[PDB]
Design an enzyme around this catalytic site. Structure first.
Site: not given
Ligand SMILES: Nc1nc(Nc2ccc(S(N)(=O)=O)cc2)nn1C(=S)Nc1c(F)cccc1F
Ligand SMILES: Nc1nc(Nc2ccc(S(N)(=O)=O)cc2)nn1C(=S)Nc1c(F)cccc1F
Lengths: 288, 288
Positions: B23, B43, B135
């Site tokens: 992403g 990540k 989110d």
């Protein structure tokens, strides 16, 4: 940071002339620029460590970033030998509450109108720029040599600009976004939190009318309870004051936050439709 | 910071097994602890400078500070050779939206109830601890090996704890304090901003019912306008769904923020009165 000097001795630029005050963060000095002779108030804050600089940064940023006639400007800031120095444009008349105590009397209504009008201009600018003052009172409104005022002490102020900049920041298609966020109606943008300053303005007006703010006679332990339990305060001797003064106060001193006026609305009120500072020039002249 | 390691190579502790996703912040890797064999999502975020670490710190803090079964835990974080590594407890089933696309079908109602119930437990904990997720969507709800869920991606979350701690911080007698501040009814404490997550929950439930969220067919440029102009969305084929599902959605998908339910209120709704994850164990078993 952005606005704080390192590695330089503030006293190689600014000479302490004397003391202006003393409070919880220490003494405040009258300073004079050794090159230009320009006067300043110098806050000197003992920091036990460097991490503490973050506590004082919002205030410095507000002072450095504001550009309004009725808000004090930052002249310099230094970190040196464990102290944060903040140099703020000097207001030769001192704070409104200090004048009242020196003369042993409140302001007259025409004086209050001038302070109110100018203080409101400052607040409106603050709110427009997403700043909540959060400690409005007569001790934080200072008189200039020329009979104007400047709002000071942003020590507990909130600046919602970076919050708002991060709030609107999004990538990708926001299918899940709440309509109040879509419409920019989050707490950062709505008037609700800014209106806390409008209540404090009302209390400060009564403080200028009566030397001391409502509930000054109570045990300090009782004051918050009293605010919560009580209807909003009113002027103790209402016959002394105009209907315009009393009406303005009612727009500020309103517990229903939604019904309480914004600074924008208050700017249209006849109580602040004034454009001469003469009543204040008369006051500060007598105090000189 | 508090939770980010310096000067150590993350790959001397964690071995990359493969890729889980990709992403805007880069690729996300499947990692395995070289000592314990414990699995993680890793990540790896390219930072052009050290100043950028501040952008990622709220997220790390939320992950490090939360302790709830339905919120993913932080396993490690490293700053090394200009990358921020964030290692997050691994959820072997992947995201809900990824399952729906693999199987080419939405969740059934009983499945949605389980995800909804557990997701709501997570949100309620977040809100109780002054965190707004901001989110919520099916892509950020992950399935465990055992048929439970964990909420992830706090990349744009808000944590109002330090704000609130600074908000209540005052010295001296606060004669000028607004009654809403006296009563702890500032925006930080009121439900208003947290309820944005409750709307997103509603949209995510429709997304799980229909694979894609409302307005997925529109030009992405039109979606925010559509949200603003339109009544709240409803299930496209309402005969397929229980009255309890449809009623729950109406409590979430309510434009009047004051009328929209809190997570606390929603926990008492019959749609989430479930206590077996079996429908999800059936789903994830078929996806395996
Ligand atoms: N900008 C500024 N000018 C002044 N002038 C001043 C202060 C006191 C006095 S005194 N000692 O009352 O006559 C006279 C002038 N003070 N001042 C500031 S920022 N004062 C001040 C303040 F108003 C609130 C908090 C901290 C402060 F240091
Ligand atoms: N904690 C966690 N476990 C997993 N597991 C996972 C992810 C993808 C897949 S895959 N490639 O869809 O089969 C399988 C398992 N992903 N994950 C996280 S934090 N994923 C993720 C996310 F869900 C949202 C934003 C960034 C992310 F890195």
């Amino acid at each position: 940071y952005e606005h704080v000097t390192r590695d330089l001795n503030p006293e190689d630029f600014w000479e302490i002339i004397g003391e202006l005050g003393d409070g919880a963060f220490g003494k405040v000095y009258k300073a004079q620029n050794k090159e230009t002779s320009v006067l300043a108030a110098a806050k000197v804050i003992d920091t036990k460590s460097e991490e503490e600089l973050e506590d004082y940064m919002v205030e410095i940023d507000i002072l450095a970033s504001c550009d309004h006639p009725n808000i004090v400007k930052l002249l310099d800031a230094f970190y040196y030998e464990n102290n944060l120095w903040i140099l703020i444009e000097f207001c030769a008349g001192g704070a409104v509450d200090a004048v009242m105590l020196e003369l042993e009397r409140p302001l007259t209504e025409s004086q209050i109108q001038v302070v109110c009008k100018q203080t409101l201009d400052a607040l409106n600018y603050l709110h427009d720029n997403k700043i909540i003052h959060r400690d409005l009172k007569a001790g934080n409104i200072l008189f200039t040599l020329d009979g104007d005022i400047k709002l000071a002490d942003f020590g507990v102020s909130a600046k919602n600009t970076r919050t708002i900049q991060r709030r609107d920041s999004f990538i990708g298609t926001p299918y899940w976004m709440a309509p109040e966020v879509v419409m920019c109606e989050t707490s950062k943008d709505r008037p609700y939190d800014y209106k806390a300053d409008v209540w404090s303005l009302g209390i400060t007006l009564i403080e200028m009318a009566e030397i001391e703010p409502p509930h000054h006679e109570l045990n300090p332990m009782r004051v918050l309870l009293k605010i919560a339990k009580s209807e909003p305060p009113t002027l103790a001797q209402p016959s002394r004051w105009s209907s315009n003064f009393k009406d303005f106060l009612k727009k500020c001193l309103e517990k229903n936050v939604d019904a309480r006026w914004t600074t924008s609305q208050l700017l249209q009120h006849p109580f602040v439709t004034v454009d001469s500072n003469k009543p204040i020039r008369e006051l500060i002249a007598e105090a000189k």
